[PDB]
Amino acid sequence: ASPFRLASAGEISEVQGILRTAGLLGPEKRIAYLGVLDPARGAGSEAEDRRFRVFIHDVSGARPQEVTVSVTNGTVISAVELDTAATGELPVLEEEFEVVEQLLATDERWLKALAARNLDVSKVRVAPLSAGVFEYAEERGRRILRGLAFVQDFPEDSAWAHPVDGLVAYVDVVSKEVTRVIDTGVFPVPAEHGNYTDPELTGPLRTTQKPISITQPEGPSFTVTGGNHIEWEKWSLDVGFDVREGVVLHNIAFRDGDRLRPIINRASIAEMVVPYGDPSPIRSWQNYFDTGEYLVGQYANSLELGCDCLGDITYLSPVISDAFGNPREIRNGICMHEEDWGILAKHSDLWSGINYTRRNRRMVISFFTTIGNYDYGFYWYLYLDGTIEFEAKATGVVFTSAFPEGGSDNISQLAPGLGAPFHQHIFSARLDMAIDGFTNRVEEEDVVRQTMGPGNERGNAFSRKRTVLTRESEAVREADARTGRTWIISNPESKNRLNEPVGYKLHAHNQPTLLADPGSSIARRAAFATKDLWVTRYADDERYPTGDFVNQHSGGAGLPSYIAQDRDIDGQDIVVWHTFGLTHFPRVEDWPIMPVDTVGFKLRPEGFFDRSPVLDVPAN
Amino acid sequence: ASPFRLASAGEISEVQGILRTAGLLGPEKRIAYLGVLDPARGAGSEAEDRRFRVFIHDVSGARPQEVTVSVTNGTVISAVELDTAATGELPVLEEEFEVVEQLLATDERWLKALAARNLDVSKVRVAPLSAGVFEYAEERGRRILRGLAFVQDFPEDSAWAHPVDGLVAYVDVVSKEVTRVIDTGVFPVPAEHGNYTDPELTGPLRTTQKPISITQPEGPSFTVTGGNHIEWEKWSLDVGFDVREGVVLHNIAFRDGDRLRPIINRASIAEMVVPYGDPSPIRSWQNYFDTGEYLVGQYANSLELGCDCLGDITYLSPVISDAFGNPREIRNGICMHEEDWGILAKHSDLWSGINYTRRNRRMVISFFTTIGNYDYGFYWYLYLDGTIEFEAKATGVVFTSAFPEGGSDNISQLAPGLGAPFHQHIFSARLDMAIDGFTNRVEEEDVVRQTMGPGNERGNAFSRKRTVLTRESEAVREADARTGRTWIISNPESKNRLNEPVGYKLHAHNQPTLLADPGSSIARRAAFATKDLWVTRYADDERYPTGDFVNQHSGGAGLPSYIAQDRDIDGQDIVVWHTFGLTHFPRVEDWPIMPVDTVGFKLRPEGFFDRSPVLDVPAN
Ligand SMILES: [Cu+2]
Ligand SMILES: [Cu+2]
Ligand code: NA
């Protein structure tokens, strides 16, 4: 019944049939993206209309299309032909990955480069990487991938231990042409293996770990209804899934006594970029837009009980489309569970004699994706006290290079002759706010130091200041950890019992933002990553901070163009975009498989409730 | 056996007997501090010589003494008379707290102030607080406490809901004299109760929480030998307890194959200060040095299985001295257990076909202390991957005031007429480092941005720089979150297999440091709190960042005096002092009992190991 239900296999099958009957899904067509559209703003929307947005690629070279279909009515709403030289190429297709290695295997320049290095072409794996936009005029309007080579000594070998430096190739994957092969010089291929399941490397496995058993003998405290609607400890929300963004949370609300109070209308990770900081021409173009170029939802892992998710686990198995419109299930792709989270509140009072302890809990919604060498876990947490938190967990195998004789200012050494280029992992959270409703504003809160003097004779006072962001042109903000800077999202029309506007405070980790030069290609294409906080006025079509078509788009799309409209955001329907990331100088301990590192943000109530919201938690 | 074993009841009784026999502990004497001294530098050395340091107060007004005793030999090693007007007063005695309310109840100025407010003296509780050093010349050399009043409507009432603003009194607790009673005017006493166990306020308790059961069917993975020596998943350490500092960690080492490698010789929270930012004369003197003035270990809670600590718990019950030298056991005062900690490492490789997942765990060592209205949890974590982390959990009841009718820039409103002054909670971690031995150095690491141009034509490169701190005068450092600043502790004489010095990296939370005016009394007494990182050369008597005697001591001791020696710290036996804290602008949700908020720091290996140290973790 819910407009926010997960897409079903039958819905995707019907999209396929509609596209087919309409003549838009011939044998030369490929679906590069398919997803359900959210309902438009309408607090009286009764008629069910499930609409899907599709990006259709053409393998023969014809122009691609963007199509919207109504599966409820069995109709095509609109279909637009795309000029990709202007608006950007479609996301990379899974089937285009294999094409790069196969094309290069018959190119005489590639084979000559491998022969000079005494490498058997049958053992050379090619990582197919997005191209970006640089100096090659012949690439505009063409679907390009760039390839970097790694040697696999045997079929179960970790090829990442054996980069082939000094060599890169560019490939047109539509016309199947190798456009350039660049060979800058012979580097030794690092010889040590990185096989983290080889006993020669692990040594004898530990026998000292005893089991930790986490069970819920009466079942979990949350309920799931309608497939994806969660109720847990006064929280209410819908768990969505999109092939581009991954897990999306809808309609996050909190039951405060009799009233269901909205907090966040839609929360997602709307982009994530991995820029590399090695100036070598072999890699200086390397920037992954994992969400926008690759689509992180389509590479989601099936999560194994007891290994990936421990405890009493409830799974969702989202359905996506393959390249031909057939539904594909990602079995056990989302884990949901609650877990103990230590002490919530504690006080032992001398005067009253009362000793009081309560425990905390959090609800966890998670999925994991794998893009080539990297694996990312996305975790949303809901706490008893009203806190919402997101955490990204980065693991996998670091991207490698040769370690140059004489060292490097931009590459870490991991093993003899083996390097790991410096890079960042930067995320954009898109938070469509609805604090007690849609009339919201953002205030920037700084600590204020005060000077010793009249009214502050002992020099102990300090205070704080709040600045309302009133228009989009002034709503591009930077972190300031030294002044304790946070941002408050409030509803000026909804007051708590002290007659103060209700609000939530955003706490950032204050990690560095994009380090690249402001004139670089990546700074233009990932402009969102240069500032910690952006606020826009809500609009239906302003979905991603990098625009709809990120692959090989020249720049400026997304947030810089939205913000230019300079719309009123003071007590309006607004969207908060928070940039946060990890700056990774790889360490020896990251090799040959990297222990998890984390980054995130959290939102805490700030006078949203009339008192602590967890006074009714029992002692248990 | 071990020189680092916990003090036993018999050792404390023996100290009492030695002091009595020596004539230093007659009926007018009180023990204000007693603790075991760590062994001096040198392996083996004294075979076994357990020495105790004692601060002895005299209730007749005679000069107090500092005494060192050898319990092994039954001798007084040294005993020195203290001039407290010079070097500071002794820590506050538990028995002195009761004195304050009783003395005020018979003072006619106090009674007249209460009569003006129609308050029954039998219902007025007085919070006895440390005095600091301000403008009152008559306090020099006297033991003073200051008292703030709260009304308790009935014996089980939370008095914190009913502050009596406009009133403060100062008390000489040795001569039993009320020195001053200051009344700046009548404020309404806030009338709403704050009784968080009253059903009228909690409402009906939730029935929705189902149990989470955490068990270890084969017992825990760690072993405890010699009372306090822990071995867990390659870690080795001794858990100490001191009545001033609380839990102290000794001899933290990691078993790397055949070798036990030292990392940290001694880790403790060596001071913690809570300064208030309300310029009202009623509270502008208010600064708690919970460690140095009150002694946090003295007020450690007994922790209840299933509520405070959940899982398979191993307890330690440390013994401290009471004011007469009798041993007192804090039953179940320290909880130890291991916890699942999610995914450790994960990769699904397309080319090799291998899917790999391992889970993380951490060892937890914790205790909780209650100082009046506040309750603090101290948590040390050891992780499988070599990470060490500390986290402080702040909860309890916020300190209250009236909320002035026309508002305030320095106080939050929590309830009608009820305010909560702004304050900070600032900690000092003292890390006596021993990275692969005692020859250590500290490097500050900043990210370096690079300009687009020759050698960086695409404007993508970024790098980092490390600056060695060579002398104490240059080792007072500030955070810089914008440049990703961290500090590396390395051993220049111990190299990993890549011929790089082994090291650990300190990751700070980059929260604001002390906000008070640098000319204030608190900035002089808590000078450590004005900077994020200090490095000193190890010395036996440089134990606390505030000096030995903090109570009513002006500036002139502690870290600023230590670093003036300007000692060589480049490849030497060094101590890192890290300041970190919370800046608390109280919110409505903090009332009437505060949900936990947290702050901390972590240390991660940085080329300490030759590869990932968790390759031998099993799947299971
Ligand atoms: Cu990385
Ligand atoms: Cu506080
Ligand atoms: Na040291």
Question: Secondary structure of A286-324 in the HEC alphabet?
Answer: CEEEHHHHHCHHHHECCCCECCCECCCCEEECCEEECCC
- Contact assessment for residue A433 and residue A264, using Cβ atoms and an 8 Å cutoff: yes
B611: chain A residues, CB-CB within 8 Å: 201, 415, 588-589, 591-592
Distance A428 CA to ligand 2 centre (A): 31
Of the partner residues A214, A481, A523, the one whose CB lies closest to the CB of residue B479? A481
- In a mutational test of the B interface, the residue from A207, A405, A462 whose CB has the highest number of chain B CBs within 10 Å is A462
Sign (positive or negative) of CA dihedral A3, A6, A9, A13:
positive
- Contact assessment for residue A161 and residue A592, using Cβ atoms and an 8 Å cutoff: yes
Cα B3 from Cα B19, distance rounded (Å): 22
Tell me which DSSP letter residue A209 carries. P
Cis peptide before B586 (omega within 30 of 0): no
Please count the residues of chain B.
Answer: 620
CA A527 to chain centre: 16
| CA distances in angstroms from A610 to A350, A453, A615, listed in the order given | 27, 36, 12
- Contact assessment for residue A334 and residue A239, using Cβ atoms and an 8 Å cutoff: yes
- The Cα of B379 is separated from the nearest Cα of chain A by a number of Å equal to 11
- Please tell me whether residue A472 adopts helix, strand or coil conformation: helix
Distance B547 CA to ligand 3 centre (A): 19
Structure tokens at A409: 């200012």
- Please tell me whether residue B123 adopts helix, strand or coil conformation: helix
Distance B268 CA to ligand 3 centre (A): 13
- Specify which residues A351 forms β-bridges with: none
Please count the residues of chain A.
Answer: 620
Distance B540 CA to ligand 3 centre (A): 11
Cα B506 from Cα B503, distance rounded (Å): 10
Could you please report the per-residue DSSP string of B358-416? EEEEEEEEEEEEEETTEEEEEEEEEETTS-EEEEEEEEE----EEPPTT--SSEEEEET
CA angle B9, B15, B20 (to 5 degrees): 130
A356 → chain B, closest CA residue: B197
| CA distances in angstroms from B482 to A10, A380, A480, B479, listed in the order given | 50, 26, 8, 9
Q: Which residues of B are annotated as a binding site?
A: 288-299, 371-376, 423, 425, 584
Tokens 């060892």 belong to: B363
Cα A295 from Cα A529, distance rounded (Å): 18
CB contact set of B359 (below 8 Å; sequence gap of 6+): A307, A310, B340, B341, B342, B343, B344, B617
Q: Which residues of A are annotated as a binding site for substrate?
A: 288-299, 371-376
CB contact set of B214 (below 8 Å; sequence gap of 6+): A212, A213, A214, A340, B310, B311, B312
Instruction: Answer yes or no: do B155 and A352 touch at CB < 8 A.
Output: yes
Q: Which residues of A are annotated as a binding site for Cu cation?
A: 423, 425, 584
Of the partner residues A345, A458, A589, the one whose CB lies closest to the CB of residue B134? A458
Structure solved via? X-ray
Cα A216 from Cα B214, distance rounded (Å): 9
Instruction: Answer yes or no: do B346 and A156 touch at CB < 8 A.
Output: no
CA A361 to chain centre: 25
Of the partner residues A347, A386, A415, the one whose CB lies closest to the CB of residue B397? A347
Cα A290 from Cα A292, distance rounded (Å): 6
Rg (CA), chain B: 26
Question: Secondary structure of B193-235 in the HEC alphabet?
Answer: CCCCCCHHHHCCCCCCCCCCEEECCCCCCCEEECCCEEEECCE
Of the partner residues A125, A206, A589, the one whose CB lies closest to the CB of residue B616? A206
In the sheet where A374-383 sits, what is the strand order? A314-316, A334-348, A355-371, A374-383, A388-396, A594-605, A501-508, A486-495, A441-449, A462-469
Class of residue A87 by CB neighbours under 10 A (exposed 0-12, middle 13-18, buried 19+):
middle
Of B207, B216, B311, B211, the closest CA to residue A219 belongs to B211
- Please tell me whether residue A241 adopts helix, strand or coil conformation: strand
Cα B289 from Cα B271, distance rounded (Å): 7
Of B174, B142, B144, the closest CA to residue B28 belongs to B174
Active site residues of B: 290, 374
- The Cα of B18 is separated from the nearest Cα of chain A by a number of Å equal to 34
CA B200 to chain centre: 36
Instruction: Answer yes or no: do B216 and A213 touch at CB < 8 A.
Output: yes
A125 → chain B, closest CA residue: B351
- Contact assessment for residue B93 and residue B130, using Cβ atoms and an 8 Å cutoff: no
One-letter amino acid at B255 equals R
- In a mutational test of the B interface, the residue from A146, A347, A375, A514 whose CB has the highest number of chain B CBs within 10 Å is A347
Could you please report the per-residue DSSP string of B268-303? EEEEEEEEB---STTTTT-EEEIIIII-GGGGBPPP
Instruction: Answer yes or no: do A416 and B498 touch at CB < 8 A.
Output: yes
**Segments of chain A assigned to CATH 2.70.98.20:** 196-619
- Cα-Cα-Cα-Cα dihedral of A123, A124, A127, A133, to 10°? -170
Q: Which numeric CATH code is attached to B196-619?
A: 2.70.98.20
Of A86, A445, A619, the closest CA to residue B197 belongs to A619
Tokens 């060695």 belong to: B468
Q: Which ligand is nearest to the CA of B535?
A: 3
Of A113, A435, A211, the closest CA to residue B361 belongs to A211
- Contact assessment for residue B401 and residue B422, using Cβ atoms and an 8 Å cutoff: no
Q: Pairing state of beta strands A314-316 and A287-289? A: unpaired
One-letter amino acid at B380 equals W
**Segments of chain A assigned to CATH 3.10.450.40:** 1-87, 94-195
Structure tokens at B4: 């680092």
- Please tell me whether residue A56 adopts helix, strand or coil conformation: strand
Could you please report the per-residue DSSP string of A72-97? TTTEEEEEEE--HHHH-PPPPPHHHH
CB contact set of A112 (below 8 Å; sequence gap of 6+): none
Extended beta strands in A496-564, E state: 501-508, 533-537
CA atoms within 13 A on the CB side of A155: 1
Cα B358 from Cα A587, distance rounded (Å): 20
| CA distances in angstroms from A382 to A233, A442, A465, listed in the order given | 9, 22, 29
Q: Which ligand is nearest to the CA of B590?
A: 2
Cα B564 from Cα B541, distance rounded (Å): 15
- In a mutational test of the A interface, the residue from B346, B348, B466 whose CB has the highest number of chain A CBs within 10 Å is B346
Active site annotation includes A538: no
- The Cα of A230 is separated from the nearest Cα of chain B by a number of Å equal to 14
Distance B582 CA to ligand 2 centre (A): 8
Cα B334 from Cα B328, distance rounded (Å): 15
Could you please report the per-residue DSSP string of B512-553? ----S-TTSHHHHHTGGGGSSEEEEE--TT---TT-S--BT-
Of B242, B296, B375, B285, the closest CA to residue B91 belongs to B296
- In a mutational test of the A interface, the residue from B146, B347, B375 whose CB has the highest number of chain A CBs within 10 Å is B347
Q: Read off φ and ψ for residue A408, nearest 5 degrees.
A: -155, 145
CA angle B124, B129, B135 (to 5 degrees): 115
Class of residue B94 by CB neighbours under 10 A (exposed 0-12, middle 13-18, buried 19+):
middle
Instruction: Answer yes or no: do B607 and A588 touch at CB < 8 A.
Output: yes
- Please tell me the class of the A94-195 domain: alpha beta
Greatest CA separation found in chain B? 87
Tell me which DSSP letter residue A291 carries. I
- Contact assessment for residue B179 and residue B137, using Cβ atoms and an 8 Å cutoff: no
Distance A81 CA to ligand 3 centre (A): 68
Cis peptide before A592 (omega within 30 of 0): yes
| CA distances in angstroms from B466 to A409, B30, B201, B485, B532, listed in the order given | 12, 51, 56, 10, 17
Q: For domain B1-87, give its CATH number from 3.60.21.10, 1.20.272.10, 3.40.50.720, 3.10.450.40.
A: 3.10.450.40
- Please tell me whether residue B84 adopts helix, strand or coil conformation: helix
A152: chain B residues, CB-CB within 8 Å: 351-352
Of the partner residues A346, A375, A385, the one whose CB lies closest to the CB of residue B347? A375
Q: Pairing state of beta strands A486-495 and A441-449? A: antiparallel
CA A31 to chain centre: 22
User: Residues whose CB is under 5 A from ligand 1 (ion)?
Assistant: A 584
One-letter amino acid at B260 equals L
Cα B320 from Cα B323, distance rounded (Å): 10
- Contact assessment for residue A65 and residue A31, using Cβ atoms and an 8 Å cutoff: no
